[PDB]
Specification:
This is part of a larger assembly, with 2 copies of chain A (about 260 residues), 2 copies of chain B (about 450 residues) and 1 copy of chain C (about 325 residues). With about 260 residues, chain A is of the alpha/beta class. Chain A contains 11 helices and 8 strands. In chain A, helix 1 packs antiparallel against helix 2, helix 3 packs parallel to helix 4 and helix 7 runs parallel beside helix 8. The structure holds cobalamin (B12) (2 copies), 5-methyl-5,6,7,8-tetrahydrofolic acid (2 copies), iron/sulfur cluster (2 copies) and calcium ion (CA) (2 copies). One calcium ion (CA) binds next to loops of chain A. It is classed as transferase/vitamin-binding protein.
C-alpha cells in the first residue's frame, strides 16, 4: 500500500497561509510528520486562493524535496502548473490528475513519459462523476489504452474511480469497489489504482472509523495506492494489516512497525 | 480470463458498430465481460482463432508418453514456484544406452535398468523410459537394438536417431507403443513430422539456441502435430537454467505458444557424480524429461529422492504408515512410544530414539498427517484414538511390561488414556530431543 | 514474431556480509570472504549481477565427532587434532571456510572448560588463514559463557558466531556488537519467526549486513522441500524490498544429511539402495545442490568428496548465462 | 452482516466446566453478553472435551433459548448430535458444518430442508483444506448443485472457505477472498457465505487488529455472515461501517448504534 | 457469463469428459469462469442455443413502434426500481378511436389528438400513437377508417381487430409505418404471425392470465416473429399491477424468455378521472404502452407530466433551464437574485421569493445543475462565470437599478464580482428562508 500525504493542501489553513507569505516552516514540518507516519508520498496542492498556480506549485516542490526524498504528488487541474512542477522535481513524481478527455490525455500522457513519472487517471470526462461500474470501467480502459498508445509503463498508471461521501452518495461506495475489482480485466500486467480515502468520510460521524474501514475493503478489491491521512496512526495499522492479509508482505509480529519504517 | 487490452490490440479499430457496440475498445470490454460473442464481428480471421486458442487453454500442453498403465504424463504446468500452488507431473527419468554395444552388454545393461526401482520412507521410486541412441555406422544395428530392448523391458521408450529412414525402420515394430522421436531438426523436420503423424507418437524438437527453437516449432505445429517436447540444445548446466526458465516463463506469463511444451534435458557431465548433480538442477529448473547415462542404484537414489520431494503438494503434509515401527533389535521388553503419523513428527522421534541406541517400538497413530499439537487441537489425537490404536496392534502381547510413553506436549492425555486403555502412562519431554534424558530415568 | 527474453528486474538486493579480517583490518586471516550481493534469483545472471559465488565451509569439532564410520575415514589422520583438522580441509580438500562446531562444550559430553573452548578457537586461528564460523554445542548456559569468551579473545578476527534463536538472542548479540563480530539467526523452519528474529536482533542496533539466516534445513527426503520453499520465499522478499529477509542464507547440510540412514547404511543391509560410499557422497551433495537453487550462500558440509563435487557445481553455475 | 456468537464453545475453560457439571449460568450469561454486542446468532459447540455429544448438545439448546430468542447455530461433526439438537429448537435453526462428500451431503442436506433451517457448507474434503480458489469454488459448486438437488433455498446456504491463521497460512487469506469474490458469480441467486473470522488471528500479535480488518475485506468480497467475538466493540463498529460502505443499510449518524441494537 | 448452476442443469448428465473436463459439474465452473467454450460438448439439447441467447441478450428486447423520426422505442429496461439506475424508454401513450363513428366525427376527434402537445416549464410533452378499434358490424368499414386516420395524423398507429382477413385489407396502405397489430389470440395466432411476418410489424400478444400468455408467446417465437409486446389480459388495476410486476420480475431476475418483452396496458375505467388515475398506476408499474379513451387536454397534462418525471436520471442532478425567471409581477425596480440551476436550489429560492410575495428576478446560471456550494468548490460558480451570465441573461435591460443579490454562502465573491460586473454586489442570507427578512429591511 502506498500512503500519499494529503495534509499539504491549500484547503487547509496553515498551508494556505504559508504559500501566501512563502513560509517554508509549516510546509516542511508536515512533510516530516507525515513521513514519520509511514507515508511514502506527499501530495502537494496550492489551493483555490492563490491566483498564480504555476509559481506557487514550484515553491511547494522546492521546499518539500528539501527535507524529504519521498515521491512527490502534484495535485492541480492546471496542466501548466503540473509540467512547471515536474521540471523542478529532483526525483520521481506523480501527476494528479487526468480524465478520459482526449484534450487532456494528448497533453499529459506524453508529459508523463517525458519526465518518466507516474500518471493518475480519473474515470470521468466533461460530464462528471458516473455511478455504475460499467461506466467507470469504460473510461478506465481508455486510460489503459492511452498508456500503451503513448508508451507509458502500465505499472505507472493509477486509476481513480473517484469516491464520494458515504452519506449523500452511499450508492457510490459499492460501485467504486466493483470498479476496482474489475480493473484487473483491463490489461496484462494490470495498472495500479488509487483513491482519495478521506472523501468517503466527508461530513460523516467518526471519520477515522469510515476511512480505515473503506481502505481495507478497497485493498481487497486491489487498491494499490491511497491518498489519506498520514498522521492517523489507527489508519496506518489497518493499511499494514490489510497488506498482510493480501500476502503482499511476509508476516511478522512487528508488521505494523515494519510498515512505518519500510 | 482475457485482458481488455489484449483483446483490443487485435481488433480492426474501425469503430463501425456492426458488433452492436459503438467502438472496438468498448467491444473489447464486452468480450472480457462476456457481454457478446467474438463471432459477431465478421472482420479479422487469424486473430479470432489465435485468441480463442490462447484464452481458454493451459499455458503448458499435455503430451502423454505412450499408452497403458506404464505411460506417464509430461508438461501440464502452471507455476514457476512450488509454493505458489504445486508441481503436478514429476520429471521423467530416462537412461541412455548406445547401439554399438554388443548383445550381451546390451541385455546386461537393460536388465540393470529394469531394477532401478527403490523403496524408501514408505515410498516407491520408479524411472520412466530408456533412451536408444544411434552411434553405430550401420543403420541395421539401430533396429536390432531397439527390438532387443523392447523384449526385456516393459517401460517406456525414446529413440534418438537423426535420419528419419533409420528411425522408421526401427520404429515399425514398436510403433504401437510409446517411443518418443528425438529429434526433429531444422533440416529434417519434414520427414520426422510425418513419422510421428502416422504412428501418433510424441516428437522432440531440437534447436541450437533459444531463437532457432522458436522458428522450428511453429513450422512443425503448422503441419498438424502439436504433441512436442522442446530441446534448446543447452549442453551446459548454466546455459540450461537460463533457457529452461524462459520456456516455463514465456509460456505461462506471456502465453508464448511456441514454448508451451515440456522440456527434454540432456546431461553432458562426464563424471557420473557430476551428472546426478547436474540432473538435480534440471529437475528443479522446470525440465520435464532428463536423459541420464549412469545406471547405478548408487546414483539414481538421491536423484529420485529429490524428484519425489519437489513434486509433493505443500498443502497435504507427508505421512508415515499407521503401524508400530521397530527401532533396533527390540527384545519384547523395550519401551513403547506413541506419536503422530505426520512425517516430520515421526522422524523427529525415530532419529532421536535410534540415536540413543537400543531397541524400542514406535506407534504412529493415524492423524491423517497432522502433528501432535495439530491433531491435538483438531481432536484427531485424543485419549480415545490412542487407546484404540493401542489395541489395533494387539501391542500388549509383544511387550511384557504395560507401560507407554506419551508426548510432553499432549502429556495431559495421561489420566484419561491410562484408564480406557488399561495401560499405564508416563509423560515424556515436550521436545523429542529429550528421548535421551528419559531413558536414563 | 521473434523472441524477447523476459527479465525480472529486482527492486532490491540481498545483503553483502563480510567474513573475516586481515592484518590491516585488525585480523590475522589471509583473505576476507564476502557472501551475498545477488540481485536476482539463484544463478540468474541474465536479469541480475551475481558478484559473489556461494562458499563451502567444512565442519571441524574441538573433539572427535560421533559421525558414522564412513564419514570419519577421510579424517582419520587429523580427526583428533582440530589444528591439523582445519589445516587439511583447506589445503587438501579445498575448503572456503572452517566451521568450528564445539560439541566438546556440552556439559554431558566432553565438558571442556571455557578457557579450553577459546584455546581451540585460537588454535584454528593459527592453523588456517580462512574465516571461521564458530557456534556452540546447544546448551544455553554454556554457550553464553563460551561464545562470549570466544568473541572477547578472538576480537578483531571478524568471525561468525552462530546458533542464535528467538528465545535466545540477547546474550549472543551483545557479544557480537562490542567485539565487531557477525551472527547467525536460526529459525525452526518458519519464515515468520525468521523475519521476526532479524528484527529483534537489529533493534539492539546491530547492522543488517552482520546477520545471516539459518532456516534449519531439513535433510534430503526428510522434508527438504519445506526448507527449499522457505529459502525461495526469503529470496523473493529480499528482491522485493523486504530488508528483514535480505540476510544471506546459511545451510547446515553436514548435520542433516549424515543423520539419515540412507547416507551411511551398508549395501549389505539395504541391497536396493546400493553401495554406501557413492550414496553418502551424493546424499550430502544433492541435498546441498538443491539449496543452491534456493539461494544458499554459505554451505556447511562435512564429507570431502561431497564438497569437491558441489564446488564443481558452483563453478559451473557461475558461468554467466546472460543473453 | 450476520455476526454469530463464538464464545459458547467447549474449548474454553468456563464452558467446558459448564458442560461436565451441567451449569446453565455460564451458558446463559454468554448468551446475553454476546446479544448486547450485536450478535443475532449463537454458535453452540460442545467441544472435544465432553465425552458424549448427544446428551450435551440437547442440554445446550434448552438453557440457551431460556434467556435468548436468537438464531441457534449447531456446530459438530456428529450427525446424531446435530439432528438431536434440531429437536428442541423452537426458533430458527442453522447447522454446521458439512463437506462436499456425498457420504456427508445426503445425511445433512435433507436434514436442513426438513426443519427448514440454514446449512453451512465447507469447501473441502477428507484430504484437507484446499489451497487455491479454483479448488474451493469446485467444492462450492458441488454444494450449490446439491442445494438445487435436495430442494433447498439458495439464501439458506452458507459457504465457508475456511479461513486459516495469517502466520502459517498467510497465503490462504488472499485465496479465501478470491473465493468469496467468485462465489456470487457461480450462482444466481447467489448463496450466502460465512467465515471463522477469529481463526485468522490465531497466535498473532494484536488479534483484534487482524480480525476486524479481515472482516471488512471479506465483506467487500461479498461476505454475508461471519462467526467471531461479539464482545469486541471494535469488531462490531467495523461490521456496521462496512454495511454502510456496501449500501446494504441506509446511512445515519448513529449507524454504529443501530447495528448494535438491530 | 451466466450462473454456473443454470448451465449445469442446462448441461446433460453424461459425465463423459469429451469436453476436456472430468465431469459436467466441473465443466460448468470452467464455462462461468471462461476456461473453455461450450461448443466442445456435443451432448447438448436445444438448450445450447438457449445458453447462447439467454446469457448474452438483455432481459427485455427492444421493439420499435414505427419508422423514421416518428418512430418510438419500447421495452429495453433492466430495473425493478428507478432509484437504482433509471428507466430508459418512456411509456408510449395511445388514444383510442372507434370506427363506427361517422367520417366527420372521426376526423374531428383525431384533430384534437394531434393537439395533445404540451409545453411546460421549458420542456415539451407529446403522445406517440393512435389506437384504431373495430366495433362495426362489417369488415369493409375498417379499411376506410384506418385510411382516414392515417391520412390525417403523422403519429404512430395501432390497429385492433380479431379477424386477420379483416385486418390485412386495412393494412395494405398503412403497412409502411409498421403499425402495431393487436392482438394475437390462441385461436388465430397462426394467421396473425404470418401477416406480421410479411409486413415486418410488431405483434401484440394477448393471453388470459400469466399462463396462457407465456404459452402463446413461445408459439409465435417458434414461427420466427420475435417483435412482441405482452398483454396479461388484466382489466382491473389490482390485477394489472401484480401481473405487470411478474412480467417485469421474471424477465429481469429469472431470465424468463417468454416474458422478456415490453407490456401493453388497457385502461378500463369508465369515468375519465378514474381512467387517468388508473393510467398513472400503469406507467409506474413497469408498463411500456397504455391505451387511453380520453382525448381531453385536461386529462393528459397531469399524466404526461408524471411520465416525464418518473423516467429521469437520479444520479444526474436535475437542471432548471438557464435563463431569468420572473416572480409575480416584475417592476424594473424589483430586486435581482442570482443562484444555481440545480432544481433543489432554485426551487427553494422560488418558494422563498413567491412565498414572501416580493416581485423580483431569478438569474439561475448553468452550474451543470450543481448546488451553489458545489459549484463554489469545483470552479463552476466563480465571479467570472457569474458576471458572464449577467451579460448573457440580458437582465440589464429589464431593470433601472444595477444591484444583484448573491447567496450568503459565497458572500466572498461579492467584491471581485462587484468590480467585474459593473453592478453593486450585495451578500444576502446563507439560507433562502431569511430572504423575506432581508427584503423588508
Ligand atoms: C503448521 C500448523 C498448523 C497446520 C498443520 C501442519 C501439520 N502438518 O500438522 C494447519 C495450518 C493446517 C493448522 C491447523 C490447526 N491448528 Co495449528 N499449528 C501449526 C503449528 C505452526 C506447527 C505444527 C508443527 O508442524 N509442529 C512441528 C511438530 C514436529 O511438532 P509436534 O507435532 O508438537 O511434535 C513435537 C513434540 O510434541 C514432541 N513429540 C511428538 N510426539 C512425541 C512422542 C514422544 C514419545 C516424545 C517423547 C515426544 C514427542 O516432539 C516433536 C518434535 O520435537 C503450531 C505452532 C507451533 N509452531 O508449534 C500450531 C498449533 C499446533 N495449531 C493449533 C491449532 C489451534 C490449530 C487449529 C485448531 C486452528 C483452528 N482454529 O481451527 C487447526 C486444526 C483444525 C483444522 N485443521 O481446521 C495450536 C494447538 C493449541 C490449541 N488448540 O490451543 C497451535 C500450537 C497454535 C498456537 N495456538 O500456538 N496448524
Ligand atoms: C447533494 C450534495 C452533493 C452532491 C451534489 C448534488 C447537487 N446537485 O448539489 C454531490 C454528491 C456531487 C456532492 C459532492 C460534493 N460536495 Co456536496 N453537498 C451536497 C449537499 C448534500 C446538499 C445539496 C443540496 O441539495 N442542497 C440544497 C440546496 C437548495 O441548497 P443551496 O444550493 O445551498 O441553496 C440554499 C441556500 O444557499 C439559499 N440560497 C440559494 N441561492 C440563494 C440566493 C439568495 C439571494 C439567497 C438570499 C439565498 C439563496 O437557499 C437554498 C435553500 O433555501 C450539501 C449538504 C447540505 N444539505 O447542505 C453538501 C455540501 C454542499 N457539499 C460540499 C462539498 C465539500 C462537496 C465536494 C467538494 C466534496 C469534495 N471533497 O470534493 C463535492 C463537490 C465536487 C465533487 N463533485 O467531487 C460541502 C460544501 C462545504 C465545503 N467545502 O466543505 C457541503 C455543505 C457538505 C458539508 N461540508 O456539510 N455534494
Ligand atoms: C479530492 N481528493 C482527491 C485527490 N486526488 C484524487 N486522485 N482523488 C481525490 O478524491 N486529491 C485531493 C483530495 C484528497 N486530499 C484531501 C485533503 C483534505 C481533505 C479534508 O477532509 N480536509 C478537511 C479540511 C480541514 C481544514 O480546512 O482545516 C475537511 O474537513 O474537508 C480530504 C482529502
Ligand atoms: C473453528 N471455528 C470455526 C467454526 N465454524 C466454521 N464453519 N469454521 C471455523 O473456522 N466454529 C468454531 C470455530 C469458531 N469459533 C472460535 C472459538 C474460539 C476461538 C479462539 O480463539 N479460542 C481461544 C482459546 C481460549 C482458551 O483456551 O481458553 C484461542 O486462543 O484459540 C476462535 C474461534
Ligand atoms: S464490428 Fe468489429 S470493427 Fe466494427 S466496431 Fe465492432 S469490433 Fe470494431
Ligand atoms: S462433454 Fe458434455 S456430457 Fe461429456 S462430460 Fe463434458 S459436459 Fe458432460
Ligand atoms: Ca491490483
Ligand atoms: Ca454473496
Amino acid at each position: 500500500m502506498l500512503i500519499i500525504g494529503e495534509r499539504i493542501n491549500g484547503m487547509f489553513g496553515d498551508i494556505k497561509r504559508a504559500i501566501q507569505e512563502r513560509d517554508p516552516a509549516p510546509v516542511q514540518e508536515w512533510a516530516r510528520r507525515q513521513e514519520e507516519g509511514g507515508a511514502r508520498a506527499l501530495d502537494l496542492n496550492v489551493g483555490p486562493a492563490v491566483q498564480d498556480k504555476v509559481s506557487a506549485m514550484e515553491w511547494l516542490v522546492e521546499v518539500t524535496q528539501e527535507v524529504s526524498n519521498l515521491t512527490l504528488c502534484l495535485d492541480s487541474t492546471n496542466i501548466k502548473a503540473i509540467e512547471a512542477g515536474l521540471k523542478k522535481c529532483k526525483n520521481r513524481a506523480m501527476i494528479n490528475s487526468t480524465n478520459a478527455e482526449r484534450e487532456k490525455v494528448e497533453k499529459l500522457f506524453p508529459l508523463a513519459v517525458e519526465h518518466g513519472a507516474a500518471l493518475i487517471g480519473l474515470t470521468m470526462n466533461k460530464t462528471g462523476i458516473p455511478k455504475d461500474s460499467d461506466t467507470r470501467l469504460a473510461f478506465a480502459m481508455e486510460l489503459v489504452a492511452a498508456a500503451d498508445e503513448f508508451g507509458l509503463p502500465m505499472e505507472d498508471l493509477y486509476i481513480d474511480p473517484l469516491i464520494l461521501p458515504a452519506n449523500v452518495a452511499q450508492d457510490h461506495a459499492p460501485e467504486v469497489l466493483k470498479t476496482l475489482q474489475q480493473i484487473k480485466m483491463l490489461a496484462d500486467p494490470a495498472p495500479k489504482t488509487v483513491l482519495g480515502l478521506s472523501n468517503v468520510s466527508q461530513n460523516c460521524q467518526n471519520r477515522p472509523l469510515i476511512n480505515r474501514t473503506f481502505l481495507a475493503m478497497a485493498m481487497a478489491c486491489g487498491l494499490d495506492a491511497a491518498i489519506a491521512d498520514a498522521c492517523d496512526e489507527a489508519l496506518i495499522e489497518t493499511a499494514a494489516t490489510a497488506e498482510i492479509l493480501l500476502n503482499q508482505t511476509v508476516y511478522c509480529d512487528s508488521f505494523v512497525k515494519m510498515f512505518k519504517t519500510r | 480470463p482475457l485482458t481488455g487490452l489484449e483483446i483490443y490490440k487485435q481488433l480492426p479499430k474501425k469503430n463501425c458498430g456492426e458488433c452492436g457496440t459503438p467502438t472496438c475498445l468498448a467491444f473489447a470490454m464486452n468480450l472480457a465481460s462476456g457481454k457478446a460473442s467474438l463471432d459477431s464481428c465478421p472482420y479479422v480471421s487469424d486473430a479470432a482463432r489465435e485468441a480463442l486458442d490462447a484464452a481458454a487453454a493451459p499455458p503448458i500442453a499435455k503430451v502423454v508418453l505412450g499408452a497403458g498403465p506404464t505411460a506417464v504424463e509430461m508438461g501440464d504446468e502452471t507455476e514457476l514456484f512450488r509454493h505458489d500452488k504445486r508441481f503436478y507431473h514429476e520429471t521423467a527419468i530416462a537412461i541412455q544406452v548406445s547401439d554399438n554395444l554388443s548383445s550381451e552388454e546390451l541385455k546386461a545393461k537393460v536388465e540393470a535398468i529394469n531394477g532401478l526401482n527403490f523403496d524408501r520412507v514408505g515410498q516407491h521410486y520408479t524411472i520412466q523410459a530408456i533412451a536408444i541412441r544411434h552411434d553405430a555406422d550401420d543403420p541395421a544395428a539401430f533396429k536390432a537394438a531397439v527390438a532387443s530392448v523392447a523384449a526385456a523391458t516393459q517401460l517406456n521408450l525414446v529413440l534418438m536417431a537423426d535420419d528419419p529412414d533409420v528411425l522408421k525402420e526401427a520404429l515399425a515394430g514398436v510403433a504401437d507403443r510409446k517411443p518418443l522421436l528425438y529429434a526433429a531438426t531444422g533440416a529434417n523436420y519434414e520427414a520426422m513430422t510425418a513419422l510421428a503423424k502416422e504412428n501418433n507418437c510424441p516428437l522432440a524438437v531440437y534447436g541450437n539456441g533459444l531463437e532457432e527453437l522458436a522458428e522450428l516449432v511453429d513450422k512443425i505445429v503448422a503441419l498438424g502435430h502439436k504433441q512436442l517436447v522442446l530441446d534448446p540444445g543447452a549442453r551446459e548446466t548454466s546455459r540450461a537454467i537460463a533457457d529452461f526458465t524462459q520456456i516455463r516463463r514465456l509460456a505461462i506469463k506471456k502465453r508464448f505458444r511456441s514454448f508451451g511444451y515440456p522440456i527434454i534435458a540432456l546431461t553432458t557431465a562426464a563424471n557420473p557424480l557430476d551428472e546426478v548433480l547436474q540432473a538435480v538442477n534440471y529437475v528443479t529448473k522446470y525440465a520435464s524429461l532428463v536423459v541420464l547415462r549412469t545406471d547405478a542404484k548408487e546414483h539414481l537414489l538421491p536423484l529420485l529422492s529429490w524428484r519425489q520431494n519437489l513434486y509433493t503438494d505443500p498443502q497435504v503434509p507427508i505421512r508415515v504408515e499407521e503401524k508400530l515401527n521397530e527401532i533396533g533389535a527390540v527384545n519384547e521388553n523395550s519401551p513403547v512410544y506413541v506419536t503422530t503419523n505426520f512425517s516430520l513428527t515421526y522422524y523427529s522421534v525415530e532419529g532421536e530414539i535410534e540415536s540413543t541406541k537400543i531397541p524400542s517400538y514406535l506407534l504412529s497413530v493415524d492423524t491423517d498427517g497432522l502433528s501432535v499439537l495439530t491433531a491435538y487441537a483438531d481432536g484427531k489425537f485424543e485419549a480415545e484414538k490412542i487407546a484404540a490404536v493401542m489395541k489395533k496392534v494387539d501391542l500388549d502381547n509383544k511387550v511384557k511390561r504395560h507401560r507407554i510413553i506419551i508426548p510432553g506436549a499432549v502429556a495431559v492425555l495421561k489420566g484419561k488414556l491410562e484408564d480406557l486403555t488399561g495401560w499405564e502412562v508416563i509423560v515424556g519431554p515436550r521436545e523429542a530431543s529429550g528421548i535421551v534424558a528419559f531413558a536414563r530415568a | 514474431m521473434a523472441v524477447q527474453i523476459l527479465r525480472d528486474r529486482s527492486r532490491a538486493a540481498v545483503q553483502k556480509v563480510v567474513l573475516g579480517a586481515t592484518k590491516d583490518q585488525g585480523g590475522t586471516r589471509s583473505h576476507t570472504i564476502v557472501v551475498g550481493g545477488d540481485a536476482a534469483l539463484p544463478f540468474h545472471h541474465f536479469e541480475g549481477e551475481i558478484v559473489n559465488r556461494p562458499v563451502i565451509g567444512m565442519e571441524v569439532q574441538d573433539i572427535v565427532p560421533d559421525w558414522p564410520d564412513v564419514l570419519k575415514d577421510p579424517f582419520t589422520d587429523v580427526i583428533n587434532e582440530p589444528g591439523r583438522w582445519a589445516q587439511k580441509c583447506v589445503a587438501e580438500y579445498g575448503a572456503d571456510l572452517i566451521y568450528l562446531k564445539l560439541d566438546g562444550a556440552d556439559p554431558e559430553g566432553a565438558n571442556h572448560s571455557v578457557d579450553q573452548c577459546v584455546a581451540t578457537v585460537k588454535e584454528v586461528l593459527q592453523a588456517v588463514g580462512v574465516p571461521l564460523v564458530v557456534v556452540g554445542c546447544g546448551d544455553v548456559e554454556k554457550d553464553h559463557e563460551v561464545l562470549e569468551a570466544v568473541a572477547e579473545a578472538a576480537a578483531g578476527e571478524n568471525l561468525l558466531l552462530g546458533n542464535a534463536e528467538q528465545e535466545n538472542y540477547k546474550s549472543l548479540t551483545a557479544a557480537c556488537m562490542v567485539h565487531k563480530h557477525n551472527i547467525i539467526a536460526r529459525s525452526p523452519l518458519d519464515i515468520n519467526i525468521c523475519k521476526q528474529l532479524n528484527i529483534l536482533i537489529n533493534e539492539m542496533n546491530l547492522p543488517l549486513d552482520h546477520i545471516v539466516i539459518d532456516p534449519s534445513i531439513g535433510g534430503l527426503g526428510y522434508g527438504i522441500e519445506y526448507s527449499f520453499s522457505i529459502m525461495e520465499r526469503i529470496r523473493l522478499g529480499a528482491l522485493q524490498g523486504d530488508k528483514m529477509l535480505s540476510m544471506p542464507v546459511i545451510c547446515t547440510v553436514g548435520y542433516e544429511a549424515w543423520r539419515a540412514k540412507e547416507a551411511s547404511a551398508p549395501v549389505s543391509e539395504y541391497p536396493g539402495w546400493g553401495k554406501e560410499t557413492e550414496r553418502g557422497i551424493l546424499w550430502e551433495a544433492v541435498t546441498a545442490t538443491a539449496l543452491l537453487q534456493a539461494g544458499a550462500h554459505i554451505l556447511l558440509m562435512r564429507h570431502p568428496e561431497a564438497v569437491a563435487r558441489v564446488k564443481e557445481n558452483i563453478d559451473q553455475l557461475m558461468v554467466s548465462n546472460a543473453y
